[model samples]
Target chain A: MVRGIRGAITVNSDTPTSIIIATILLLEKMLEANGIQSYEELAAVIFTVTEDLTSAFPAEAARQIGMHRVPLLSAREVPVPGSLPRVIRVLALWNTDTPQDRVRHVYLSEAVRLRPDLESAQLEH
Target chain B: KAKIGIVTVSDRASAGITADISGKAIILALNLYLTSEWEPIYQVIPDEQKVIETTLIKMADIQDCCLIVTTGGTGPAKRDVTPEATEAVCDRMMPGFGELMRAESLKEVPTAILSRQTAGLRGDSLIVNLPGDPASISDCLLAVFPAIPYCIDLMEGPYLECNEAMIKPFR
Candidate 1:
């Protein structure tokens, strides 16, 4: 079975470096929470960013973590009124026998407020 | 860029009654699955087996498409003959692709049993028949796409690179 693990984080700035660092932090925490030991177990990762952030693609962060064989894509999130800004979200499709209920979703930094239900899964780092 | 054929075999879509959503779904899934450079040779044709056969040939022989993915005409409907057309134009059949897709789809909907989707090798090109529904298109493709790059490699097609975080091709 394949399950999706979701994560999100807020970048302090719109710079490419800031986006990359935030994305990497979010993915690392998500992987850790979900016990993802190998990138080979991932089917795909889709990243979405708010309109305010356009300096770089969040997929670059996965590449920076040596995920060269995985398929990564990025798109703009729907611009809604009063939504979070400078937020990067990821949905990773993982091939595993783990049940969906056990999967953990990571929301870090200011984006932790995006998913209050998943606050326990937030990383301290 | 590697050339890939996206074939929409539907009487209605070909007649412009409805848009070819299934073909578009294949392109969307491919965009997420493949990181290497690639371009689509898109076509919209009716559910005529003869036309489908010829189009597959032209895509493989003339266009030099390494992979040809077709949507529609794979169900039990009277005009559903994509599998027959694929079998007619290919040198070998890969049954596992269809089996895996059916298994995966069956998990969501029981009607997947009615699907006749299949894959075959025509020279260096690999043609895969998929269900017409846009949602099923993504499901079926994701089920079997992990092996697609290695299959193309075995056929001496262009090297295909994938993003490790999205789909890790098991070479």
Candidate 2:
């Protein structure tokens, strides 16, 4: 069966380096939390970023971290009024036999408010 | 580092009338399937058999590409000649690649029967002809890519490692 892994992170700054770092942190935490053993299991990863975080693409972080074989793509998130800024979100399609209930979703930094129902699943690191 | 050739054979796209999304799809699919260090010798040329044949030879001989994947010109149309070009330049032809792709594609769309895609080996490089539509590129590539690494190995080329979960190559 296929599974979708969701993750998000908010950065304090709008710089390219910051966006890259925050994306890496969120992805790493998501992988660790969900026990993703290898990057090969991922079919594709789609990233979306808020309007204020255009300094760089969130998918660049995946490339920097040795995910050369993973299909990583990025898109701009629709700007909404009074929404969170400097946020990067990812939806990863994974080809795995793991049950959906066992899959973990990660929310980091100030983005934790986005998914309070899964707060316990978030990593403080 | 290993090298792969990407040939986008489309008259319209080559003339800047439209974008070459099919070639981009192949590149993206390879990126998702390979972890080895490799670069693309990319080209966008018109649907001319002579140019296609020359480009394949140059990539295989001079550029030293381990794999050359071509998009477009695989249908039954008069201008479609990618398979013929691949066969002309290759030392041996591998019909199974095209067979499996068409079999897989037939499950999705009935028009897949019109495609004449094929694969072959020229020197050390493995060339596979693919269809022009961007939507079909991924399906066709994934259907046949599981055997590509081993084919490259047989030709004394690079050892390709894929992300196992996405694609586990049969040994």
Candidate 3:
């Protein structure tokens, strides 16, 4: 069965390196928490950035991590007034036996504030 | 055998004021469309978003249902929160399903544009929000079901065998 692993992180600046590094950290935590072992198990990865984030694509982090064959998409999220800024969110579509609730969604570096009810999102990663 | 979830998101229905024929409509259509053996996990709940989200999560995560079809609560109205609930629990959005369903529904009525109906992926289970009317439920479900089996296959879920005469799944 396929499962979607959600993740997000924040960068101190809009630099490409900061966006890329933060995404890499968030993505790795999501995978590790969910026990994803191989790249072939992934079908696609999608990234959405808050309107203030315009330096680079968060999906580039996946490409850098050698997810070469996996389909990736990057887009701007809806610009909600009073919403968080400089945030990059990812949805990793994985083809696996893992159930929905069992899948771990990682949130780190201020992104943890997004899902206060989630223990996994509140992790120290 | 596969497990399918049929959830009726209606306040009156759950309150016992009206029958949940909308969800039953989904089951009835599936019976004719699918050749594979399967069981249904059914629920009749209010139009509350939290209830809908929790029910969907249980069906996809604990019940392991390959498909969770919800009827009712998809519209521009204030109480119609089914699409929002589905989007919340889903890992990814399948916008094409909604686009196709709306396109097909538009062929019958101009009000189809008002529908907020959508589909999303939650684990192996696909949560689809259908309109409240029993007739519209059948119309939208049949319109998009030709691609449903292939979607499950892509997810590495159960091979949903369809009765080709009624609906030929694109594999």
Candidate 4:
């Protein structure tokens, strides 16, 4: 039950729809990678985006994918001092028997540069 | 964020015959009181015991629910099996909840004695069987609500912060 995932995707466009699309895409990939088949298995998710990225709310993406049938919410990422710009972060909680090391954290597009070491193994698939 | 489940339980409403009154009331009341970052995973189900049991079990075991307050099915009628369904799923019952609800509700209506409202915990989620009447719901809620936040906390769920004007929290 301790399968927690942290992942993000960066967008060049600052539109709400663009951020929504990117979040949905990354979320789908994360679920697929971790073998999550149902939205019911998802306990809850916390979404955070950098200060510069204010176009959209991340939780809206889940709603688009029928998460209105589940529990979902959105929040702003702390405007950390000198942190990565235009970045979005997610903390996914699931009730899985999988171990921590095997769980994949997806960082896509420009956000890949944020975690070079963890990217290669996950991307290899 | 604390994950609360809103279950609308009724034969008519679940079958689209009428509007859900108490379901919406719970959400409205929670919005006023809940200050914690929280979201409701909502569901509408019929009065069948099997369906209620399945839905309650799923909300508790799989949905990671801290609290699930259901609206409907509290009476002497044959179909009024919410309390029975609730009893079947719960590992243990909190009788003081039902007692206080009846005690408080008597001030409003003499028939409040007939309301078999109750509350219990399934795994970590606290499932409460409430009256179908929207007005009586507030009375029953006021009686049992004072203990809800602490019960969830004791179950190792999220810390449910409150708005002082609407609800008083215990340390």
Highest TM-score against the true fold, candidate: 2
Per-residue C-alpha lDDT of model 2 across residues B2-45, encoded as one tens digit per residue: 99999999999999997675676677667667887999899999
lDDT of 4 at A52: 85
Better of 2 and 3 by TM-score: 2
Model 3, residue A79: distance off in Å is 54
lDDT of 3 by residue, B36-146 (tens): 899989999998999999999999999999999988888888999999999999999999989998897797579989999899998778888888764456567767888
Better of 1 and 3 by lDDT: 1
For every candidate, give the share of true A-B contacts it also has.
0.00, 0.00, 0.00, 0.00
For model 1, the DockQ equals 0.03
Report the C-alpha displacement of residue A9, candidate 2, in angstroms.
Answer: 26
Clashing pairs in 1: A43-B166, A44-B166, A69-B163, A69-B164, A70-B163, A70-B164, A70-B165, A71-B163, A71-B166, A71-B167
Per-prediction TM-score: 0.59, 0.60, 0.57, 0.57
Q: DockQ for each candidate?
A: 0.03, 0.03, 0.01, 0.01
- On lDDT, the leading prediction is 1
Give model 3's TM-score versus the native structure. Answer: 0.57
With candidate 2 superimposed using the best TM-score fit, by how many Å does residue A52's alpha carbon deviate from the native?
33
Candidate number that wins on lDDT, 2 or 4: 2
| B25 Cα displacement, candidate 2 (Å) | 1.0
